[PDB]
Amino acid sequence: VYLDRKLLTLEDKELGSGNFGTVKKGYYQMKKVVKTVAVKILKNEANDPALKDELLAEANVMQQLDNPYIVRMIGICEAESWMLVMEMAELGPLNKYLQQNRHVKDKNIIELVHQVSMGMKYLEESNFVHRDLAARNVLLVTQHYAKISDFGLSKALRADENYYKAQTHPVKWYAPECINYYKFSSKSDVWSFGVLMWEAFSYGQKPYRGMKGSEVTAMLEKGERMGCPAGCPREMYDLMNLCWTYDVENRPGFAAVELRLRNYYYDVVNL
Ligand SMILES: Cc1cc(C)cc(Nc2nccc(-n3cc(CN4CC(O)C4)c(C)n3)n2)c1
Numbered sequence: 001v002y003l004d005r006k007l008l009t010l011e012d013k014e015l016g017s018g019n020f021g022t023v024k025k026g027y028y029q030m031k032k033v034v035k036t037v038a039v040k041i042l043k044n045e046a047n048d049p050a051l052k053d054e055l056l057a058e059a060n061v062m063q064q065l066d067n068p069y070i071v072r073m074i075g076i077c078e079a080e081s082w083m084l085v086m087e088m089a090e091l092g093p094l095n096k097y098l099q100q101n102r103h104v105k106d107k108n109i110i111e112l113v114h115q116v117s118m119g120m121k122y123l124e125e126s127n128f129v130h131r132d133l134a135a136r137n138v139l140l141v142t143q144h145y146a147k148i149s150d151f152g153l154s155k156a157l158r159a160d161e162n163y164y165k166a167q168t169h170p171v172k173w174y175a176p177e178c179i180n181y182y183k184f185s186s187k188s189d190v191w192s193f194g195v196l197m198w199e200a201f202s203y204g205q206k207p208y209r210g211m212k213g214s215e216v217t218a219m220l221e222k223g224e225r226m227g228c229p230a231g232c233p234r235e236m237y238d239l240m241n242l243c244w245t246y247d248v249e250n251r252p253g254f255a256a257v258e259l260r261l262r263n264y265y266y267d268v269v270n271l
Helices: 049-063 094-099 106-125 176-181 186-201 213-221 234-243 254-269
Strands: 008-017 021-029 034-042 073-078 082-087 138-142 145-148
Touching: 008 034, 034 049, 034 073, 049 073, 049 082, 094 138, 094 186, 106 138, 106 145, 106 186, 106 254, 176 186, 176 213, 186 234, 186 254, 234 254
Parallel strands: none
Antiparallel strands: 008 021, 021 034, 034 082, 073 082, 138 145
């Protein structure tokens, strides 16, 4: 679990950047083979151990998760910086990939979001809230194999509550109960999966283009939702709207969302 920096080699170039630091391709020498890895490296000119604790929390969540459609942690490494080492998904973020591969078919995108729904079904069963479910945090192992990434904001739910109460705030992916009451549940992940599906079938376009968060909030408060993406199957658009049910209780969970994705995939495969 605590990895050896000497057995790890990092690429000089970055896969992607952010607030924390960098994400880099690496190779980690395992039993007698090497494993290609992606490594989240924390920038600390200064120690600010606060950020450090966030990385170990992110690791602490991944540690407990075991599913084919969730990114696997190899472990963490304390070296010239703090590092979270993960199994490499070579093709990278779904949104960027679909931007650059418009030739990809409906059926393929349905397969991809269905795999995400399966990964989220597991997360729901395990009582973890993702809290950041978007197309940028779906990574492709192949064109036909997707994995959910980025657990920096995830929370293990309490055994007596089905939700997590946050502090002050991503708005475009948040269900209304998150905006108004700061309440995060598997149902708010379901709302977010709706936005993610909209992203997928728009080939990586941004949701609610050119709108401030308060305008998005206001639009949703008056019963309005994003329009159908050009070319999107009707059944997937219908599913998006069901995911954007205002009322938390009547909004479906991932079990029901997954099932409705199975059936339509097989329908598209058998049409
Ligand atoms: C070609 C390419 C580019 C990029 C940016 C990522 C990969 N794939 C890969 N694989 C395993 C883990 C990660 N992780 C990437 C991250 C950073 N996330 C990508 C979300 O956009 C932020 C994390 C926590 N794990 N990423 C592949």
